[PDB]
DNA sequence: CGTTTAAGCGGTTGCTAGAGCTGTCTACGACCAATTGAGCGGCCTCGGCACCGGGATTCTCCAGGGCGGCCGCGAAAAGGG
């Protein structure tokens, strides 16, 4: 997935889309419950790989 | 201490250097007036060093393309009742 969009070719069309949704998920996530202290976020229960 | 030798003193004999005195004069330096150009201060400008803007040149990083390994998953061959 590349496109141009102001004589800048090559550029990632989709990884410009994700980025901007899941930084706007981690900033809205963190503000929520952790706006005192950013330091502690947890993950909870959720198991990565 | 023994021995030789040269300093010290007195003497010759003539000429010349030098101090002292007297005399003349002449070039040379003090002195004065007019003049001006070489010394001291400032003013202006260039040679060279340095500061700043602009352009050419080479090094570093982020992302895409391709390949390997796992994850159970699922179709399929063989065995049992």
């Given at each position: 997935?590349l ?17 901007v ?29």
């Amino acid at each position: 997935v590349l496109f141009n969009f102001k004589g800048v070719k090559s550029l990632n069309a989709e990884s410009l889309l994700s980025r901007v949704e899941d930084l706007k998920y981690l900033k809205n996530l963190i503000n929520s419950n952790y706006k005192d202290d950013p330091l502690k976020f947890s993950l909870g229960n959720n198991t990565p790989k």
